Amino acid sequence: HISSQQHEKAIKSYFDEAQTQGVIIIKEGKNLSTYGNALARANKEYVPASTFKMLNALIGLENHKATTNEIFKWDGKKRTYPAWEKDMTLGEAMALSAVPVYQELARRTGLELMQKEVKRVNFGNTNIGTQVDNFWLVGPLKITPVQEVNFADDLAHNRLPFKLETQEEVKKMLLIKEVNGSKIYAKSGWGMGVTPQVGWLTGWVEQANGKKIPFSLNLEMKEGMSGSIRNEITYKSLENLGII
Numbered sequence: 001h002i003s004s005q006q007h008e009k010a011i012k013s014y015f016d017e018a019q020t021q022g023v024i025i026i027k028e029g030k031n032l033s034t035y036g037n038a039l040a041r042a043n044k045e046y047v048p049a050s051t052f053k054m055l056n057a058l059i060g061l062e063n064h065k066a067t068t069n070e071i072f073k074w075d076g077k078k079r080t081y082p083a084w085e086k087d088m089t090l091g092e093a094m095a096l097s098a099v100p101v102y103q104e105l106a107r108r109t110g111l112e113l114m115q116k117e118v119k120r121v122n123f124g125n126t127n128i129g130t131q132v133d134n135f136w137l138v139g140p141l142k143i144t145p146v147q148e149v150n151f152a153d154d155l156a157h158n159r160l161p162f163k164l165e166t167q168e169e170v171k172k173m174l175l176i177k178e179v180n181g182s183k184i185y186a187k188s189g190w191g192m193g194v195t196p197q198v199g200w201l202t203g204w205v206e207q208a209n210g211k212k213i214p215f216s217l218n219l220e221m222k223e224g225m226s227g228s229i230r231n232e233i234t235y236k237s238l239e240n241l242g243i244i
């Protein structure tokens with residue numbers, strides 16, 4: 001019973017209050033809706049940053065480059081965060097957004113195979129260039145927030161060109177929140193090596209009854225904001241629209 005005018009104002013305000021510029025795109029069935037305080041972001045291109053982990057994992061598992069239970073050893077060298085100085089599964093690495101695990105996986109896959117799986121999946125601008133281990137962080141691979149939500153819609157519905165079983169395994173890695181019988185599956189993205197910095201939270205809500213509502217939040221990370229603003233805004237918006 002809320003006017004759409006009021007949903008629009010309430011969601012814009014969640015971005016206004018964090019003092020950033022951003023958008024969240026929601027997909028109900030085949031219908032895309034854009035909210036936020038910077039609507040024109042919707043079809044601009046940004047690096048996927050760690051959102052790429054979802055595709056990177058799909059590629060690695062499908063092509064037998066790791067298993068769901070394989071433990072990637074920490075090599076013992078100092079890491080940018082101490083939470084990374086441990087051995088982990090791809091799943092654990094997904095939750096921690098541990099890039100060196102995912103770069104290990106990228107190296108196993110190899111530049112050639114990576115390029116072909118990324119052209120095959122039609123992901124973003126599909127260009128990975130010559131560096132197998134940072135293409136999703138500093139370019140040249142770029143994707144828009146529309147493409148990101150459509151990629152989430154595909155994964156959520158198992159429509160990507162990977163075995164059903166590969167898709168279920170990557171989806172088990174993605175559960176970040178349970179809120180009143182709804183489950184939020186998603187991956188965060190933080191473009192730290194680019195100016196300005198991009199922040200993403202891409203996924204879908206799986207409702208009490210099996211409807212799945214894909215979404216993609218996309219904003220600018222400002223000097224010392226924390227990661228969880230991405231989540232917080234996503235959750236405020238989703239609740240505001242009665243999706244969760």
Ligand SMILES: *[B]([O])([O])C1=[C][C]=[C]C(C(=O)[N][C]C2=[C][C]=[C]O2)=[C]1
Nearest residue numbers: 049050097099137189190191192193
């Ligand atoms: B991801 O979006 O969660 C993510 C995690 C850790 C590190 C990065 C990253 O963007 N590193 C970039 C780096 C390369 C040169 C300078 O900084 C992303």
